[PDB]
Scaffold this motif. Structure first.
Motif, PDB file in Angstrom:
ATOM      1  N   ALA A 647     -15.235 125.538  -7.458  1.00 32.55           N
ATOM      2  CA  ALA A 647     -14.890 124.117  -7.303  1.00 32.55           C
ATOM      3  C   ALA A 647     -15.023 123.606  -5.871  1.00 32.55           C
ATOM      4  CB  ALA A 647     -13.486 123.838  -7.830  1.00 32.55           C
ATOM      5  N   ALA A 648     -14.675 124.453  -4.895  1.00 28.26           N
ATOM      6  CA  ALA A 648     -14.727 124.091  -3.469  1.00 28.26           C
ATOM      7  C   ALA A 648     -16.133 123.738  -2.977  1.00 28.26           C
ATOM      8  CB  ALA A 648     -14.126 125.204  -2.606  1.00 28.26           C
ATOM      9  N   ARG A 649     -17.151 124.321  -3.605  1.00 26.14           N
ATOM     10  CA  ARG A 649     -18.527 124.051  -3.219  1.00 26.14           C
ATOM     11  C   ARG A 649     -19.333 123.244  -4.244  1.00 26.14           C
ATOM     12  NH1 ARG A 649     -19.794 129.328  -5.485  1.00 26.14           N
ATOM     13  NH2 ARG A 649     -21.341 128.605  -7.043  1.00 26.14           N
ATOM     14  N   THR A 650     -18.771 123.031  -5.443  1.00 23.99           N
ATOM     15  CA  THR A 650     -19.295 122.003  -6.375  1.00 23.99           C
ATOM     16  C   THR A 650     -18.687 120.624  -6.079  1.00 23.99           C
ATOM     17  OG1 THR A 650     -18.483 123.584  -8.082  1.00 23.99           O
ATOM     18  CG2 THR A 650     -20.324 122.125  -8.701  1.00 23.99           C
ATOM     19  N   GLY A 651     -17.676 120.584  -5.212  1.00 25.79           N
ATOM     20  CA  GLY A 651     -16.992 119.343  -4.868  1.00 25.79           C
ATOM     21  C   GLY A 651     -16.079 118.828  -5.961  1.00 25.79           C
ATOM     22  N   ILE A 652     -15.474 119.766  -6.688  1.00 24.56           N
ATOM     23  CA  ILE A 652     -14.554 119.457  -7.774  1.00 24.56           C
ATOM     24  C   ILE A 652     -13.138 119.669  -7.275  1.00 24.56           C
ATOM     25  CG2 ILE A 652     -13.699 120.240 -10.057  1.00 24.56           C
ATOM     26  CD1 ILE A 652     -16.600 120.715 -10.844  1.00 24.56           C
ATOM     27  N   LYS A 653     -12.305 118.645  -7.414  1.00 22.24           N
ATOM     28  CA  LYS A 653     -10.901 118.772  -7.041  1.00 22.24           C
ATOM     29  C   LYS A 653     -10.034 119.012  -8.263  1.00 22.24           C
ATOM     30  CE  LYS A 653     -11.408 115.102  -4.101  1.00 22.24           C
ATOM     31  NZ  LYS A 653     -12.429 115.085  -3.004  1.00 22.24           N
ATOM     32  N   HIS A 654      -8.805 119.468  -8.022  1.00 22.18           N
ATOM     33  CA  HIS A 654      -7.858 119.768  -9.103  1.00 22.18           C
ATOM     34  C   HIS A 654      -7.522 118.495  -9.872  1.00 22.18           C
ATOM     35  CE1 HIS A 654      -4.774 121.978 -11.308  1.00 22.18           C
ATOM     36  NE2 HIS A 654      -3.938 120.989 -11.045  1.00 22.18           N
ATOM     37  N   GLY A 655      -7.597 118.604 -11.198  1.00 23.95           N
ATOM     38  CA  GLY A 655      -7.428 117.454 -12.092  1.00 23.95           C
ATOM     39  C   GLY A 655      -8.531 116.405 -12.086  1.00 23.95           C
ATOM     40  N   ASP A 656      -9.688 116.721 -11.513  1.00 23.08           N
ATOM     41  CA  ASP A 656     -10.895 115.914 -11.692  1.00 23.08           C
ATOM     42  C   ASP A 656     -11.309 115.997 -13.166  1.00 23.08           C
ATOM     43  OD1 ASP A 656     -13.174 115.945  -8.769  1.00 23.08           O
ATOM     44  OD2 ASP A 656     -11.169 115.087  -8.981  1.00 23.08           O
ATOM     45  N   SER A 657     -11.781 114.884 -13.713  1.00 24.97           N
ATOM     46  CA  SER A 657     -12.309 114.895 -15.056  1.00 24.97           C
ATOM     47  C   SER A 657     -13.735 115.420 -14.954  1.00 24.97           C
ATOM     48  CB  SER A 657     -12.278 113.491 -15.634  1.00 24.97           C
ATOM     49  OG  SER A 657     -13.319 113.335 -16.570  1.00 24.97           O
ATOM     50  N   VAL A 658     -14.026 116.543 -15.625  1.00 25.49           N
ATOM     51  CA  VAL A 658     -15.370 117.146 -15.561  1.00 25.49           C
ATOM     52  C   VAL A 658     -16.017 117.252 -16.932  1.00 25.49           C
ATOM     53  CG1 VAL A 658     -14.790 118.536 -13.442  1.00 25.49           C
ATOM     54  CG2 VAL A 658     -14.902 119.698 -15.671  1.00 25.49           C
ATOM     55  N   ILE A 659     -17.339 117.408 -16.945  1.00 27.41           N
ATOM     56  CA  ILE A 659     -18.094 117.642 -18.177  1.00 27.41           C
ATOM     57  C   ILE A 659     -18.542 119.094 -18.274  1.00 27.41           C
ATOM     58  CG2 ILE A 659     -20.232 117.129 -19.455  1.00 27.41           C
ATOM     59  CD1 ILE A 659     -19.862 114.184 -18.204  1.00 27.41           C
ATOM     60  N   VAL A 660     -18.053 119.762 -19.311  1.00 31.84           N
ATOM     61  CA  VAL A 660     -18.488 121.106 -19.657  1.00 31.84           C
ATOM     62  C   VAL A 660     -19.616 121.010 -20.673  1.00 31.84           C
ATOM     63  CG1 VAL A 660     -17.779 123.407 -20.315  1.00 31.84           C
ATOM     64  CG2 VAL A 660     -16.072 121.826 -19.377  1.00 31.84           C
ATOM     65  N   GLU A 661     -20.705 121.718 -20.394  1.00 27.73           N
ATOM     66  CA  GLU A 661     -21.901 121.625 -21.194  1.00 27.73           C
ATOM     67  C   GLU A 661     -22.541 122.984 -21.397  1.00 27.73           C
ATOM     68  OE1 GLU A 661     -25.458 118.465 -21.498  1.00 27.73           O
ATOM     69  OE2 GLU A 661     -24.523 118.800 -19.519  1.00 27.73           O
ATOM     70  N   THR A 662     -22.926 123.237 -22.652  1.00 29.05           N
ATOM     71  CA  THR A 662     -23.675 124.425 -23.059  1.00 29.05           C
ATOM     72  C   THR A 662     -24.958 123.942 -23.770  1.00 29.05           C
ATOM     73  OG1 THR A 662     -22.631 124.653 -25.240  1.00 29.05           O
ATOM     74  CG2 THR A 662     -21.491 125.663 -23.405  1.00 29.05           C
ATOM     75  N   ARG A 663     -25.685 124.841 -24.420  1.00 32.03           N
ATOM     76  CA  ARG A 663     -26.899 124.439 -25.132  1.00 32.03           C
ATOM     77  C   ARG A 663     -26.596 123.679 -26.422  1.00 32.03           C
ATOM     78  NH1 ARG A 663     -28.136 128.702 -22.295  1.00 32.03           N
ATOM     79  NH2 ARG A 663     -30.254 129.144 -21.524  1.00 32.03           N
ATOM     80  N   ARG A 664     -25.345 123.775 -26.868  1.00 29.82           N
ATOM     81  CA  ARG A 664     -24.937 123.216 -28.155  1.00 29.82           C
ATOM     82  C   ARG A 664     -24.203 121.870 -28.078  1.00 29.82           C
ATOM     83  NH1 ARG A 664     -25.682 127.823 -27.163  1.00 29.82           N
ATOM     84  NH2 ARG A 664     -23.632 128.024 -26.135  1.00 29.82           N
ATOM     85  N   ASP A 665     -23.393 121.674 -27.040  1.00 32.09           N
ATOM     86  CA  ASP A 665     -22.725 120.397 -26.841  1.00 32.09           C
ATOM     87  C   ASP A 665     -22.307 120.129 -25.402  1.00 32.09           C
ATOM     88  OD1 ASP A 665     -21.971 117.960 -27.778  1.00 32.09           O
ATOM     89  OD2 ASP A 665     -20.683 118.733 -29.370  1.00 32.09           O
ATOM     90  N   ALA A 666     -21.697 118.967 -25.202  1.00 34.46           N
ATOM     91  CA  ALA A 666     -21.125 118.553 -23.933  1.00 34.46           C
ATOM     92  C   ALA A 666     -19.741 117.957 -24.208  1.00 34.46           C
ATOM     93  CB  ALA A 666     -22.037 117.520 -23.236  1.00 34.46           C
ATOM     94  N   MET A 667     -18.771 118.287 -23.373  1.00 36.19           N
ATOM     95  CA  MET A 667     -17.402 117.858 -23.603  1.00 36.19           C
ATOM     96  C   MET A 667     -16.717 117.473 -22.291  1.00 36.19           C
ATOM     97  SD  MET A 667     -14.643 119.795 -26.011  1.00 36.19           S
ATOM     98  CE  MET A 667     -15.885 119.758 -27.343  1.00 36.19           C
ATOM     99  N   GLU A 668     -15.943 116.398 -22.299  1.00 32.98           N
ATOM    100  CA  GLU A 668     -15.194 115.981 -21.102  1.00 32.98           C
ATOM    101  C   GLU A 668     -13.769 116.539 -21.134  1.00 32.98           C
ATOM    102  OE1 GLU A 668     -15.921 112.035 -19.779  1.00 32.98           O
ATOM    103  OE2 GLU A 668     -14.056 111.882 -18.637  1.00 32.98           O
ATOM    104  N   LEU A 669     -13.353 117.170 -20.038  1.00 32.62           N
ATOM    105  CA  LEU A 669     -12.045 117.826 -19.945  1.00 32.62           C
ATOM    106  C   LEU A 669     -11.481 117.745 -18.531  1.00 32.62           C
ATOM    107  CD1 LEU A 669     -13.137 121.055 -21.823  1.00 32.62           C
ATOM    108  CD2 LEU A 669     -11.245 119.664 -22.615  1.00 32.62           C
ATOM    109  N   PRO A 670     -10.145 117.633 -18.399  1.00 31.29           N
ATOM    110  CA  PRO A 670      -9.511 117.659 -17.069  1.00 31.29           C
ATOM    111  C   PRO A 670      -9.535 119.058 -16.440  1.00 31.29           C
ATOM    112  CG  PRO A 670      -7.848 117.644 -18.779  1.00 31.29           C
ATOM    113  CD  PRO A 670      -9.156 117.470 -19.479  1.00 31.29           C
ATOM    114  N   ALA A 671     -10.069 119.143 -15.221  1.00 24.32           N
ATOM    115  CA  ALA A 671     -10.274 120.415 -14.541  1.00 24.32           C
ATOM    116  C   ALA A 671      -8.991 120.908 -13.918  1.00 24.32           C
ATOM    117  CB  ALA A 671     -11.355 120.298 -13.513  1.00 24.32           C
TER     118      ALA A 671
END
Ligand SMILES: Nc1nc2c(c(=O)[nH]1)N[C@H]1C(S)=C(S)[C@@H](COP(=O)(O)OP(=O)(O)OC[C@H]3O[C@@H](n4cnc5c(=O)[nH]c(N)nc54)[C@H](O)[C@@H]3O)O[C@H]1N2
Ligand SMILES: Nc1nc2c(c(=O)[nH]1)N[C@H]1C(S)=C(S)[C@@H](COP(=O)(O)OP(=O)(O)OC[C@H]3O[C@@H](n4cnc5c(=O)[nH]c(N)nc54)[C@H](O)[C@@H]3O)O[C@H]1N2
Ligand code: SF4
Ligand SMILES: O=N[O-]
Ligand SMILES: [Mo]
Length: 720
Positions: A647-671
């Motif tokens: 997270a420190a080098r993706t620029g993601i902070k605690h409780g940022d809303s992020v998108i998790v994605e695989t080959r099958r779907d994409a989902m929005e979740l609080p980090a």
């Protein structure tokens, strides 16, 4: 307040804590731990707050039809429903044959329920299409135990926890998954501080907080790690030749007979300094793990989904046993290879009673001609009635539902539309226009009911009697404490009326209640190595569970399986103190399994490992724990765990809303950013029905057990 305490079992995990449910005026008002069961009076919070779930009014209390796919569920009578069920299954069979029809059950069904459905389908209808959710769970532990020992189930007991001086806890969040058993382990380390605890898990969980070593290896590399441990043990001359010479056989990488030197030579590819780079752990972690294991007086291994929910699942189990077999940490108090079972009754109900597509009751296999014939005798069937080839395992089952090879399904006490992997595929399959889906479901918010054509109102938990067998070989009875609300019926009686209305022979379902099926099951087990004939209703009613084998009414139960003079399946005059009688020569087996990885490994496109996991407050799909307000306050919603460095080098902070994605779907979740996940791994929980994470997971299966790899797929994360 209670006028009366009623003995039973906790409805949740496979720890299998006995309870006393206190009732006044036909209503439950209090719960406490049964002082005489292994749990010695204790319950976790989920357990102590079962009365609000028992008393919930958010129940399916009358039968329901959907007249057309996509329509509304409407009240229908029991007779109409029962007639709609019987005729649909019956005539599907008449038209397409037995195999167009299936049972999808559960390790949360009573043993007696599972026993009866298994007999309707396999003896009644002539199809082996009976499976259930232990396939999604214990299937790998079943393959591991069978291939290593020739029989299913652990050889030791929970009492062994009080005597281990080393614990090797791998692929297991015991703290959150098996809370009262985590407390026994912690109580052990506290009575004796010289006890060593190794937690081997990519995530840093509260289970690691009692550990002397937390091994945070890269997902998929635990087989390499455990081969390396074996190398260290043999290298530093910490093995038990007296034991492996007399009691063990060796099978090489190509599965051919081998010997110790063959083992030594295979393990040379697994030197600590090589394997440390692979696993991404410090090299001394292998040596200190291996050493604590072999050097300790008594060592217990405990494992759960991190090992089993893998395409290399059965090989991973064989590797834990390789460790005990090479050191002789087995068949004595405190020293044992102990697979954790997650469900209250995967063990008794569906594993032991063979309510899986490839199995028959009490240790029997469907391809085994002799077993088939011996079940046909015991069930009073026509010859050749039991199909010779195994039915659909769960992934194959729901693939066939979608193809239209299976046209009718009973889904009982499980939630496949929330918990099956690769849910976009599964949802597709479950919406086949010509499928007739019957759900037996207590809770109207189960997301599966959206696919149901017929819904039956079932009696819930201690609203009826039945047996649960937990992970320890203990079969405990729950008696009925209270009446079912509305028009809820016990599933045992529901299954018999269905069978009968569908032309099943009345001899086959000759049961008025669960006690009668129990007595029949007791007979089907007699003379086998699961023999629990001495476990009569009368003494289940008085004891707080008995542990099998338990072959006569004056037998105490069995703790040390395969030990002469301890286990009744070992002949008193046997020449040798141990006897691994599931193998033709009475020796257990070391298997030299090639260490590999996940079916879907990370890469440039999808550089992250993704995992799914338990949280303490919730039970699976949350239809039950979601009705206790206390269990929401901490974890109301799904989240994604992210490593601090990542997270420190993706620029993601605690409780940022992020998108998790695989080959099958994409989902929005609080980090949720922390050191819990090792660098390169993300983790989601699977309780939240508005965030259906199994959309993201692949459904690749172990080729032996057919267990899906829920534990590893490749993923990527971006800020939303
Ligand atoms: N609170 C609660 N308790 C439960 C349940 C529940 O729903 N809620 N359900 C019950 C059931 S049915 C089950 S199956 C059990 C499951 O109980 P556990 O298996 O202990 O629970 P999980 O979090 O699934 O455990 C998987 C662990 O494996 C790890 N893991 C991920 N990848 C790997 C790997 O490559 N190797 C190894 N060794 N580990 C890895 C994850 O980090 C995770 O901590 O819990 C039972 N108890
Ligand atoms: N991504 C991911 N997915 C997973 C897992 C994972 O670790 N990761 N774990 C897998 C494992 S190990 C397991 S065990 C499965 C479990 O997954 P499921 O078994 O699908 O989940 P549960 O919530 O236990 O489902 C039990 C259902 O039974 C209903 N029910 C309760 N009481 C009764 C009753 O008396 N009668 C009837 N007829 N119904 C009742 C409940 O309301 C609920 O809908 O999930 C699997 N899915
Ligand atoms: S540890 Fe498991 S069986 Fe025991 S009270 Fe808690 S949820 Fe129930
Ligand atoms: O507790 N299931 O994420
Ligand atoms: Mo499970």
């Amino acid at each position: 307040r209670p006028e009366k305490w009623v003995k039973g079992v906790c409805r949740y995990c496979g720890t299998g804590c006995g309870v006393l449910v206190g009732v006044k005026d036909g209503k439950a008002v209090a719960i406490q731990g049964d002082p005489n069961n292994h749990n010695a009076g204790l319950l976790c919070l989920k357990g102590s707050l079962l009365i609000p779930v028992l008393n919930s009014k958010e129940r399916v209390t009358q039968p329901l039809v959907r007249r057309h796919k996509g329509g509304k569920l409407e009240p229908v009578s029991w007779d109409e429903a029962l007639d709609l069920m019987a005729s649909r299954f019956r005539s599907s069979i008449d038209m397409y044959g037995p195999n167009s029809v299936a049972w999808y059950g559960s390790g949360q069904c009573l043993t007696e329920e599972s026993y009866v459905a298994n007999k309707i389908f396999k003896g009644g209808f002539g199809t082996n299409n009976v499976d259930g959710n232990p396939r999604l769970c214990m299937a790998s532990a079943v393959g591991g135990y069978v291939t290593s020992f020739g029989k299913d189930e652990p050889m030791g007991t929970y009492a062994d926890i009080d005597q281990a001086t080393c614990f090797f806890i791998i692929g297991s969040n015991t703290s959150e998954a098996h809370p009262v058993l985590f407390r026994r382990i912690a109580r052990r380390k506290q009575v004796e501080p010289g006890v060593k605890i190794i937690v081997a898990d990519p995530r840093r969980t509260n289970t690691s907080r009692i550990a002397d070593m937390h091994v945070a290896f890269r997902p998929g590399t635990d087989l390499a790690f455990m081969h390396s441990m074996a190398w260290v043990i043999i290298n530093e001359e910490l093995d038990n030749p007296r034991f492996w010479q007399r009691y063990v056989n060796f099978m090489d990488a190509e599965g051919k007979p081998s010997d110790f030197e063959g083992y030594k030579a295979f393990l040379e590819n697994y030197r600590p300094e090589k394997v440390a780079e692979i696993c991404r752990v410090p090299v001394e972690q292998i040596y200190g793990a291996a050493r604590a294991f072999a050097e300790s007086a008594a060592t217990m291994s405990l494992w759960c989904m991190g090992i089993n929910q893998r395409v290399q699942g059965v090989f991973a189990n064989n590797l834990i046993h390789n460790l005990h077999l090479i050191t002789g940490q087995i068949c004595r108090p405190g020293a044992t290879s102990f697979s954790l079972t997650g469900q209250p009754n995967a063990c008794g109900g569906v594993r032991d009673g063979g309510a899986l597509s490839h199995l028959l009751p009490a240790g029997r296999a469907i391809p085994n001609a002799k077993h088939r014939a011996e079940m046909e005798k015991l069930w009073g069937l026509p010859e050749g009635r039991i199909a010779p080839e195994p039915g659909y395992h769960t992934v194959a089952l729901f693939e066939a539902l979608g193809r239209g090879d299976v046209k009718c399904m009973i889904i009982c006490e499980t939630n496949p539309a929330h918990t099956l992997p690769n849910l976009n595929k599964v949802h597709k399959a479950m919406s086949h226009p010509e499928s007739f889906i019957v759900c037996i479901e207590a809770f109207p918010d189960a997301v599966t009911l959206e696919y149901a054509d017929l819904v039956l109102p079932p009696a819930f938990w201690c609203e009826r009697d039945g047996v649960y067998g937990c992970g320890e070989r203990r079969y405990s009875l729950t008696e009925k404490a209270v009446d079912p609300p509305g028009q809820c019926r016990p599933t045992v009686n529901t299954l018999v009326e269905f069978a009968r209305r569908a032309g099943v022979d009345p001899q086959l379902v000759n049961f008025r209640n669960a006690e009668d099926v129990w007595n029949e099951w007791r007979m089907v087990s007699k003379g086998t190595t699961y023999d629990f004939w001495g476990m009569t209703r009368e003494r289940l009613r008085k004891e707080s569970g008995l542990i099998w084998p338990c072959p006569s009414e004056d037998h105490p139960g069995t703790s040390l399986r395969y030990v002469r003079g301890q286990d009744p399946c070992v002949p008193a005059d046997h020449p040798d103190r141990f006897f691994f009688y599931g193998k033709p020569d009475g020796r257990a087996v070391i298997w030299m399994r090639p260490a590999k990885g996940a079916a879907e490994e990370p890469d440039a496109e999808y550089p992250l490992y993704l995992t799914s996991m338990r949280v303490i407050d919730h039970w699976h799909t949350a239809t039950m724990t979601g009705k206790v307000p206390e269990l929401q306050k901490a974890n109301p919603i799904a989240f994604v765990e992210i490593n601090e460095e990542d997270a420190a080098r993706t620029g993601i902070k605690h409780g940022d809303s992020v998108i998790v994605e695989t080959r099958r779907d994409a989902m929005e979740l609080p980090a949720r950013v922390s050191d819990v996940c090792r660098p390169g791994l993300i983790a989601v929980p699977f309780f939240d029905p508005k965030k259906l994470v199994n959309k993201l997971f692949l459904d690749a299966t172990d080729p032996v057990s057919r267990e899906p790899e829920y534990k590893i797929c490749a993923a990527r994360v971006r800020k939303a």
